[PDB]
Design an enzyme around this catalytic site. Structure first.
Site, short mmCIF file in Angstrom:
data_model
loop_
_atom_site.label_atom_id
_atom_site.label_comp_id
_atom_site.label_asym_id
_atom_site.label_seq_id
_atom_site.Cartn_x
_atom_site.Cartn_y
_atom_site.Cartn_z
N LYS A 139 5.04 3.11 -1.18
CA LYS A 139 6.42 3.01 -1.61
C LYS A 139 7.14 4.26 -1.17
CE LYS A 139 6.57 -0.26 -5.43
NZ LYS A 139 7.71 -1.03 -4.82
N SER B 296 11.65 5.98 -1.12
CA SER B 296 13.06 5.64 -1.25
C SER B 296 13.42 4.61 -0.16
CB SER B 296 13.96 6.87 -1.19
OG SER B 296 13.71 7.64 -0.04
N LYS C 20 6.07 -0.72 7.69
CA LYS C 20 7.04 -0.15 6.80
C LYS C 20 8.19 -1.13 6.76
CE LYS C 20 8.87 4.37 7.21
NZ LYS C 20 8.94 5.75 6.66
N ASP D 235 10.54 16.47 5.12
CA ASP D 235 9.88 16.05 3.87
C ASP D 235 8.35 16.20 3.93
OD1 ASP D 235 9.65 15.16 1.23
OD2 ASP D 235 9.72 13.05 1.80
N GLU E 188 0.10 2.22 13.55
CA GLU E 188 -1.36 2.23 13.43
C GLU E 188 -1.76 2.29 11.96
OE1 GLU E 188 -3.29 5.95 14.68
OE2 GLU E 188 -1.32 6.96 14.75
N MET E 189 -2.92 1.73 11.65
CA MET E 189 -3.48 1.85 10.31
C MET E 189 -4.16 3.24 10.15
SD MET E 189 -3.61 0.28 7.51
CE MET E 189 -4.33 0.76 5.94
N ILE F 91 0.79 -1.25 0.00
CA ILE F 91 0.00 0.00 0.00
C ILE F 91 0.82 1.30 0.00
CG2 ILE F 91 -1.88 -1.14 1.23
CD1 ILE F 91 -1.07 0.48 3.76
O1 LIG Z 1 5.14 6.06 6.82
C1 LIG Z 1 4.64 6.00 5.66
C2 LIG Z 1 5.40 6.37 4.60
C3 LIG Z 1 5.12 6.40 3.27
C4 LIG Z 1 4.05 6.07 2.50
C5 LIG Z 1 2.86 5.60 2.85
C6 LIG Z 1 2.52 5.35 4.25
N1 LIG Z 1 1.29 4.89 4.51
C7 LIG Z 1 1.22 4.74 5.86
C8 LIG Z 1 0.20 4.30 6.68
CL1 LIG Z 1 -1.39 3.78 5.99
C9 LIG Z 1 0.39 4.24 8.05
C10 LIG Z 1 1.61 4.62 8.60
C11 LIG Z 1 2.63 5.07 7.80
C12 LIG Z 1 2.43 5.13 6.44
C13 LIG Z 1 3.25 5.52 5.42
#
Ligand SMILES: O=c1ccccc2[nH]c3c(Cl)cccc3c12
EC number: 2.7.11.23
Length: 347
Positions: free
Chosen positions: A33, A35, A54, A153, A105-106, A31
């Protein structure tokens, strides 16, 4: 054969839907991407909740930087235990098949996805005000002396909705972050959101986040990046179109000044000289934010004409705040505490 066939040629873990890790995490799907690597959606059988994981690249330099990320997340979450300061929650971390895995967490989708949902019409100034207030409050948190954290960032992709129906947000991706003491990169920030001090090779502090936020809020309302440079030279030029030539007291201290500008004998600075009658940029300061925002013409593109909560007075306040955040001088650029006191936020 990369990492016994668990990795690909880009040091990323080859994700498999349905895979189950350590008798704990059922991997649902990819879900995200970056670097840094990848983010996946997973079910945690032990705690009985969806999480995001992650998965850092299996490579020394990436792992090392992620270890800094972890330190700062854990340091943030320790102060914000109630989870009221808009920073994502790091639940735990572990090494699995030679990748560092960070468990959060989601959350729902990000603000870029939200802009895309309106077909880049932009969201209302009322909703923009809500994101502005939460972000300033988050940025105030990061500014507490015991943290002193520069996210480094900020952009719409790294601000996420807690829930899709609602306006609550959390900042994610502290993978380029650092503390005010220990700054280690020169080339930082996503290009559209990069501050002048970073473009100019100068030292930087927490104020780079405020610059980025100023750019973000305009984009949230107009639907397009305010300064959309294709490279650093284009970026600096696009900033100059709106704000003019940076002040001399800055350019005189700037290592990379001569990448974009020229110093005349009388001590003033101009844009570097252009070939053969080529014209590409609006002259300095003539691309007025007043017009970009549609202050007296129905909002951006006139698309808000005769809507409530989009009066001229609303826009003048918004514009004033944004120019304070886009101050060229980091020492005078508006700081989170005072931003919250701005008339734009009046109840
Ligand atoms: O830390 C990220 C970095 C980059 C890209 C997407 C990303 N989605 C996340 C979700 Cl749903 C929950 C927690 C972190 C992220 C997250």
């Amino acid at each position: 054969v990369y990492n016994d066939g668990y990795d690909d040629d880009n040091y990323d873990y080859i994700v498999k839907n349905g895979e189950k890790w350590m008798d704990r995490y059922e991997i649902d799907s990819l879900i995200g991407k970056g670097s840094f690597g990848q983010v996946v959606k997973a079910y945690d059988r032990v705690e009985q909740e969806w999480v995001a994981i992650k998965i850092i690249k299996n490579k020394k330099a990436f792992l090392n930087q992620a270890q800094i990320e972890v330190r700062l997340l854990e340091l943030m979450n320790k102060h914000d235990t109630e989870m009221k300061y808009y920073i994502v929650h790091l639940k735990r971390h572990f090494m699995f098949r030679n990748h560092l895995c960070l468990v959060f967490e989601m959350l729902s989708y990000n603000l870029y996805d939200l802009l895309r949902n309106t077909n880049f019409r932009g969201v209302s100034l009322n909703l923009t005000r809500k994101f502005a207030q939460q972000m300033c409050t988050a940025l105030l948190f990061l500014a507490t002396p015991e943290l002193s954290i520069i996210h480094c960032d900020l952009k719409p992709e790294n601000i996420l909705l807690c829930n899709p129906k609602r306006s609550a947000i959390k900042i994610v991706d502290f993978g380029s972050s650092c503390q005010l003491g220990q700054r280690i990169y020169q080339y930082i920030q996503s290009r559209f959101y990069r501050s002048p001090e970073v473009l100019l090779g100068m030292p930087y502090d927490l104020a780079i986040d405020m610059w980025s936020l100023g750019c973000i809020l305009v984009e949230m309302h107009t639907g397009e990046p305010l300064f959309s440079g294709a490279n650093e030279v284009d970026q600096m030029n696009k900033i100059v179109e709106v704000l003019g030539i940076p002040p001399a007291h800055i350019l005189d201290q700037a290592p990379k000044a001569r990448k974009f500008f020229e110093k005349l004998p009388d001590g003033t600075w101009n844009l570097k000289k252009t070939k053969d009658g080529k014209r590409e940029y609006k002259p300095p300061g003539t691309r007025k934010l007043h017009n970009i925002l549609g202050v007296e013409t129905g909002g951006p593109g006139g698309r808000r004409a005769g809507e409530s909560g989009h009066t001229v007075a609303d826009y003048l306040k918004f514009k004033d705040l944004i120019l304070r955040m886009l101050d060229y001088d980091p020492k005078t650029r508006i700081q989170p505490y005072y931003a919250l006191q701005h008339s734009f936020f009046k109840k």
